[PDB]
From a paper:
NaRs are membrane proteins that actively transport sodium outside of the cell in response to light illumination. As all other MRs, the structure of NDQ rhodopsins consists of seven transmembrane helices (A-G) encapsulating a retinal cofactor, covalently attached to the lysine residue of the helix G (K255 in KR2) via a Schiff base (RSB). We thoroughly characterize a member of this subgroup, namely the protein ErNaR from Erythrobacter sp. HL-111 and show that the additional glutamic acid results in almost complete loss of pH sensitivity for sodium-pumping activity, which is in contrast to previously studied NaRs. X-ray crystallography and single particle cryo-electron microscopy reveal that the additional glutamic acid residue mediates the connection between the other two Schiff base counterions and strongly interacts with the aspartic acid of the characteristic NDQ motif.
We obtained the structures of ErNaR at acidic (4.3) and neutral (8.0) pH values at the resolution of 2.50 and 2.63 Å, respectively. Cryo-EM experiments at pH 4.3 and 8.0 also showed the rhodopsin in the pentameric form. The overall organization of the pentamer is similar to that of KR2 and other MRs. At the same time, the concavity in the central part of the pentamer at the extracellular side is organized differently in ErNaR and KR2. In general, while in KR2 this region is polar and interacts with numerous water molecules identified using X-ray crystallography (PDB ID: 6YC319), in ErNaR it is more hydrophobic. Moreover, the cryo-EM maps reveal the presence of fragments of hydrophobic chains in this region of ErNaR. Notably, the cryo-EM data strongly suggest that the interprotomeric sodium binding site found in the KR2 pentamer is absent in ErNaR. Although the maps show the spherical density at a position similar to that of the sodium ion in KR2, the coordination is unlikely to favor sodium binding. Another feature of ErNaR is the presence of a detergent (n-Dodecyl-beta-Maltoside, DDM) molecule in the cleft between the rhodopsin protomers. For instance, while the cryo-EM data clearly show a direct interaction between the D105 residue of the characteristic NDQ motif with the E64 residue of ErNaR at both pH 4.3 and 8.0, the map regions corresponding to these residues merge together and individual positions cannot be resolved.
Numbering used by the authors:
A (entry chain B), B (entry chain A), C (entry chain C), D (entry chain E), E (entry chain D): 1 to 272
Write the structure that this text describes.
Amino acid sequence: MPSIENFLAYDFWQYDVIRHLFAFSTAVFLAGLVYFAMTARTTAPNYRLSANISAVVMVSAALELGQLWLLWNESFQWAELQGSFVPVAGERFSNGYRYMNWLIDVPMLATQLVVVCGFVGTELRNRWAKLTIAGVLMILTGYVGQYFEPAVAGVPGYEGAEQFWIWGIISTAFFVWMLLILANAVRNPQGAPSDEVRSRLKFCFWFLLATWSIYPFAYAMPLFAPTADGVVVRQVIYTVADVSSKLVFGVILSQVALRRSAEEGFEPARVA
Amino acid sequence: MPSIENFLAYDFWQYDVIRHLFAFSTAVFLAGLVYFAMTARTTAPNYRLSANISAVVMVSAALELGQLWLLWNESFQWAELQGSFVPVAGERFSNGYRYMNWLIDVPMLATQLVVVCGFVGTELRNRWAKLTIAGVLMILTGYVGQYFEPAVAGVPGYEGAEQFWIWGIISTAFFVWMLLILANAVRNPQGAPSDEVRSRLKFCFWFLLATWSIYPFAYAMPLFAPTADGVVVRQVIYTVADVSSKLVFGVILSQVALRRSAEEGFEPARVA
Amino acid sequence: MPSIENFLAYDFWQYDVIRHLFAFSTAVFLAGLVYFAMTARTTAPNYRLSANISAVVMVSAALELGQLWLLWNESFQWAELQGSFVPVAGERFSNGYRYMNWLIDVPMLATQLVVVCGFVGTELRNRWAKLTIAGVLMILTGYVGQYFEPAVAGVPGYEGAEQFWIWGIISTAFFVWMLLILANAVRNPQGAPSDEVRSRLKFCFWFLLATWSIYPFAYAMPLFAPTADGVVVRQVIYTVADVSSKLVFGVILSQVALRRSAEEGFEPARVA
Amino acid sequence: MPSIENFLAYDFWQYDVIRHLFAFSTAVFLAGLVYFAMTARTTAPNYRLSANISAVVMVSAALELGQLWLLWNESFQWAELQGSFVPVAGERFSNGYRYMNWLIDVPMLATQLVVVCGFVGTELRNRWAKLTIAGVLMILTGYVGQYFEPAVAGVPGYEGAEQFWIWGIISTAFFVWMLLILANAVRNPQGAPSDEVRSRLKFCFWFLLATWSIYPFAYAMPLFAPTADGVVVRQVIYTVADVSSKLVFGVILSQVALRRSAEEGFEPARVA
Amino acid sequence: MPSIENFLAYDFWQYDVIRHLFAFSTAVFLAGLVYFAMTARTTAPNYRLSANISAVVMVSAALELGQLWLLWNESFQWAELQGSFVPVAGERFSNGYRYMNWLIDVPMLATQLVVVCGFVGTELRNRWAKLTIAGVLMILTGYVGQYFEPAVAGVPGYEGAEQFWIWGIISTAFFVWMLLILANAVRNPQGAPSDEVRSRLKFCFWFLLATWSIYPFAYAMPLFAPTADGVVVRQVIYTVADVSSKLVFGVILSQVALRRSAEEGFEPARVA
Ligand SMILES: CCCCCCCCCCCCO[C@@H]1O[C@H](CO)[C@@H](O[C@H]2O[C@H](CO)[C@@H](O)[C@H](O)[C@H]2O)[C@H](O)[C@H]1O
Ligand SMILES: CCCCCCCCCCCCO[C@@H]1O[C@H](CO)[C@@H](O[C@H]2O[C@H](CO)[C@@H](O)[C@H](O)[C@H]2O)[C@H](O)[C@H]1O
Ligand SMILES: CCCCCCCCCCCCO[C@@H]1O[C@H](CO)[C@@H](O[C@H]2O[C@H](CO)[C@@H](O)[C@H](O)[C@H]2O)[C@H](O)[C@H]1O
Ligand SMILES: CCCCCCCCCCCCO[C@@H]1O[C@H](CO)[C@@H](O[C@H]2O[C@H](CO)[C@@H](O)[C@H](O)[C@H]2O)[C@H](O)[C@H]1O
Ligand SMILES: CCCCCCCCCCCCO[C@@H]1O[C@H](CO)[C@@H](O[C@H]2O[C@H](CO)[C@@H](O)[C@H](O)[C@H]2O)[C@H](O)[C@H]1O
Ligand SMILES: CCCCCCCCCCCCO[C@@H]1O[C@H](CO)[C@@H](O[C@H]2O[C@H](CO)[C@@H](O)[C@H](O)[C@H]2O)[C@H](O)[C@H]1O
Ligand SMILES: CCCCCCCCCCCCO[C@@H]1O[C@H](CO)[C@@H](O[C@H]2O[C@H](CO)[C@@H](O)[C@H](O)[C@H]2O)[C@H](O)[C@H]1O
Ligand SMILES: CCCCCCCCCCCCO[C@@H]1O[C@H](CO)[C@@H](O[C@H]2O[C@H](CO)[C@@H](O)[C@H](O)[C@H]2O)[C@H](O)[C@H]1O
Ligand SMILES: CCCCCCCCCCCCO[C@@H]1O[C@H](CO)[C@@H](O[C@H]2O[C@H](CO)[C@@H](O)[C@H](O)[C@H]2O)[C@H](O)[C@H]1O
Ligand SMILES: CCCCCCCCCCCCO[C@@H]1O[C@H](CO)[C@@H](O[C@H]2O[C@H](CO)[C@@H](O)[C@H](O)[C@H]2O)[C@H](O)[C@H]1O
């Protein structure tokens, strides 16, 4: 069914904040890309896969948010008599453009944590495979569920509110599985890390867990606040979650990657 | 004739999944490009042609999928009375935008496997020429056939269903020829590879064969399911096939290229 | 509410100057990006974070000004009978696209000054955190206020002029706080700088303060000149402020970064 | 006058092939650019100008074909009652967008052959000047002529068919002059080349001559086949000519540049 | 007032040449950018600022000409009954998009000549400041004047022809001042140049002066030929001037920069 945004009108500032958020996010991820590209070689070659993944995630997210920015602009138009942005006739907005890009982001972000924990070879591949299965199944079960949000929001003539619950709860199980995989990686880092590196790996885990926990809440917003203020809050928290979970996590992880690099004698990592 | 997509209406989610898939694929290939560009020099110079080809394939595929994303958006519009995305008046969608880019992708993907098998010089050129002839003829005979899919789908007022069969079967013969060329290359690698390298080359062949086999099935979909659910399934399997055959194959091949590099003493390949 | 630009008609040259300014600015920041990207490695690794931030700021600002350029073009159309550019029906212009990108620019520009002052590690992080809090709160309180500018401009049927004052004055307090943080950094540079470096750091502070002071004036323009000549002047001073505060500041800071680099023996910085 | 394409209607596949060709070509040249950019340093510095020119030509051609792709899309629209793509009211297509970019391509492609032949300094400049004069005059006399193709095609109400002949024949004279300049360069290579290098230079000349000879035929198509099948054939042969004359020529020339590099002791050229 | 182009109708070829010119120019500057970016490190670090400026100028000019290309396309549409491209209702074309980008180009092009003359440090800064003041005042006084060209062209209902004269003559004075600054730089090169380098610096000055002299003539065209043939000639001479003054000047200057580099022992400059 169409996202709940399609069933609301917006005050100038409601619509305006959302297009600002989509545009900001695109810029953050494009800037993030320039940054990670310019800083990748400072990491020792045994950790540089993580640096490289950050650049990959930035490209994905930049395009994710650019598409949303475009479609938001296309889907609503000003109506002076109503003094509102209102849906246009032949376009419908979808928040599901973000979900499909997560098939890149989620497994990649979890993999770069496993890379900095020191797993290599089959042990890296094994974890990457488990994380990609768990991550893909979490994202595809939530994508199905978010197709039922006019129904859960009680918009008249839409049924299948229970599908929203069922698919979200299944998605939550695969989320717990991913977190257990990552928790086992950071609790068992490889390559005899320092206690400072150990602490920082544990911090990266909880940062991931906290920022990733926002997404399930954004998913449930149609159920709490199916209103234009709800829609604004939802996109606000997606913006915080996106920037945190991808760019800020990339910087924090890069800092741990550099410490490990430097503790293992990489000179570029030590002179910086 | 126009593709079978032009003769159907879509439910919100049907159209929405397809635009998500096209957008996702574009992002994957653009991210793939950043990645291959950032990782090419880690391969020894005798294998770096393969690394370079991966970047070339990513550019091609990114543009292939971007065009489809654009045309999909342009070709259908929401109709609230029908609650469907429906064709617009002056635009018609074509799946044939993908075929023409395959003239780059297919021969390039098969060439980079021959490069990692160790063929150089005329033996590389000879194989590249055979593969490019076989690949170009496979793609152009299938492009002709896919112009007859309203006819094979039984859409009234379209004739030449037999052309779809004839041209697809000819295309299948050139496909078998390409596979025989590649099978002979991976069975006879050059440069005295390890048994591990030998196995991994053989795996790359079967990965290619499996992923490339999906395309003939996507071609035949108008015959099995000329419906909007069929159209969704078709674009789903194209997405799996594209990402597998190009990006995932590029990563697997890069890993064999690095092993060979390292077994031949390239230090960047050994320190990574 | 919509920005004051939406409530005015423009003479050819009024509208034309503004689209020229938006386009110029985009070009400056894109050129700035090529430049900072091509010059970053000339800085010693202990100062290269500053070089990198400049590139990040250029990307942000390029997109900031590109969005404005687009929306300006979209929001008004020529009307030969009136001989004016006049608002279009379904689009409304917003100056608030610039505010959201400042959440990147402002803290980043203040951070790169602290980097060149020599703060590292927690002392860098501590300052970055204070600056990001102070900067985010300054920008978000001013974003709220600029949603009330038809009201402060006295456009009939818009209320809440007092909100414009309240939110602007709160924003000014966080501005003073940022300046105090930076003033303490430049007065206490680290790493035993030369007196030439000391002076140049102090100059960078006052350059920042002067150029950043323009923004509060652009904010208050609806109150002084809610007219199309006022709108032109406002965008003129934003252009001066943007180019100064971001690109010219980046060059001046790079010059101090190079002096410090060279005084610490970095050869690339000495041979240049 | 408008190009002959404007005076025809297209069957789905006629229009569809042409938009596929324009899009393919854009992708080829963008991929070509990534490739030449990633491979330029493998050439010895005395031949790297040729490598660099290839990248320049790829940018030119990518934009040449992108513009055509855009204008083709804009100029015709589907008409279900006619079952044809037909001209739109306010747009007219032009094949002359390709001509103007040739002012870059033609002299640059001929110059990079002279660079690999070994001419340097004034002897390079002298040849570059003659080639640029001969090339500019060939392209501008053919551009004038192609403005008379509805007239030569016999579209009623268009006169000046003789202008098409006159300007094409003048253009052919400057073409012969260019070929004589290049033939004198490849017959008198500099720097004591191998007999293998000598042969390969001669091959590059004939490859250039053959591929460049296609263009005069595409020019004369309005005279032979002023029909929609003629228009398809013309764009097909332009595609072959463009890819051959620019990308394939770039690869072949790069291979000669590398041989010369390696025969002169450049290690990157020898290890590859 | 709107530029004189807005008051004319065009024959197919008149409009078609201008869109070809705008598109060509964009491609030249984008190719120029790839080229200067790929060749900058061949210059000794004491001259590399000039190399870097060339890349900056290419970005500026590419965007300058792209905007014009866009607006030209948007501002006029085909009218089959008139057989002309004619103005559209809600868009008006402006040649003033080029002026604002000159605020980047002009001072940057003059600065890179002063860099290759050997001025460094404050002597460079002093000249850069004088050139930027003189250049900004020349461009802004000419921008004002070009807002009066329907008046000087005698289009009925437009007054202020004298403003066109006054502002153009003031602009010419600042032009003479810039040329005197540069003439003093090339006559007093620094760093004990060769007599060959001295001659080549003098040549670069006269090349600059000749190519820059075209712009005042393009400015005065509305006064000589306020017709569609005049508009074509004007854009033709702008194209020659742009390509000469920016790209060709960049290549000639790079050649002097390399000679100086090599005469001072930079090995990359000597091996090339
Ligand atoms: C929108 C894209 C944003 C990316 C830019 C991020 C800037 C981050 C500023 C945060 C300042 C506080 O935290 C600071 O982070 C930077 C960047 O990781 C760290 O910097 C570290 O890595 C960078 C390269 O990755 C090195 O140039 C630097 O010498 C090194 O110390 C500092 O050790 C830390 O004190
Ligand atoms: C608008 C977009 C702007 C993007 C800007 C991005 C800037 C990102 C800067 C990241 C700086 C944060 O850097 C991170 O801070 C946390 C703060 O607890 C530190 O964490 C510190 O405290 C935690 C507390 O439990 C400890 O477990 C950890 O060992 C310790 O180091 C990380 O070691 C450091 O890497
Ligand atoms: C969409 C863009 C593509 C992104 C690609 C990212 C791939 C990461 C997926 C992890 C898969 C697990 O398998 C892992 O693959 C990576 C990437 O080839 C390999 O990594 C290998 O190559 C990379 C770069 O070429 C080196 O930095 C690394 O040191 C080396 O070991 C690991 O040896 C392997 O264990
Ligand atoms: C959706 C966004 C994009 C995500 C992109 C992620 C790319 C990740 C790449 C994964 C790499 C997998 O790595 C690949 O795994 C297979 C698993 O059988 C290995 O294959 C393994 O089994 C086969 C037989 O089954 C053996 O012949 C082979 O020797 C052995 O290694 C490959 O030798 C290895 O290179
Ligand atoms: C729109 C993007 C604009 C970016 C281009 C900026 C060009 C600036 C020209 C200003 C000329 C006067 O000031 C001049 O600045 C340049 C650039 O910082 C300085 O140049 C210094 O840094 C650059 C690299 O960062 C080195 O190549 C140079 O050798 C070194 O001296 C000069 O020491 C100074 O005299
Ligand atoms: C719109 C296009 C923009 C194109 C690019 C713009 C290029 C910008 C070039 C910036 C040149 C910087 O030039 C800057 O001048 C100031 C002048 O006070 C110098 O500052 C000088 O005076 C101040 C104040 O008395 C002293 O405290 C300082 O010690 C001294 O160096 C800076 O050391 C120098 O870096
Ligand atoms: C869409 C643009 C894509 C261009 C990609 C080109 C790939 C062409 C491969 C086809 C095989 C032809 O034959 C082969 O050509 C390649 C590419 O020049 C040559 O490759 C040679 O140059 C490249 C770099 O320029 C080196 O990485 C390689 O080690 C070297 O041998 C081989 O010596 C030759 O045997
Ligand atoms: C649609 C995408 C297109 C991608 C294209 C990919 C690039 C293709 C690269 C092609 C490489 C061909 O490589 C080229 O082949 C010809 C074949 O005669 C060789 O030419 C050979 O025969 C000729 C005579 O016929 C001799 O004069 C020459 O000495 C000999 O080598 C060239 O010496 C070689 O460099
Ligand atoms: C449109 C984009 C820009 C295209 C640039 C192409 C420029 C080349 C055109 C041919 C000009 C003929 O004149 C020739 O110029 C080239 C390039 O400056 C000079 O070449 C010089 O610089 C280049 C590039 O830094 C070096 O690789 C070369 O080894 C060196 O000698 C020759 O010494 C000169 O004889
Ligand atoms: C549409 C695409 C455009 C691509 C453009 C490519 C540009 C190619 C570069 C042009 C090369 C010109 O190269 C330039 O030629 C002039 C010709 O007088 C030479 O100038 C020569 O004659 C003058 C005559 O007064 C002397 O003062 C000078 O000392 C001498 O060298 C320059 O020293 C040389 O650097």
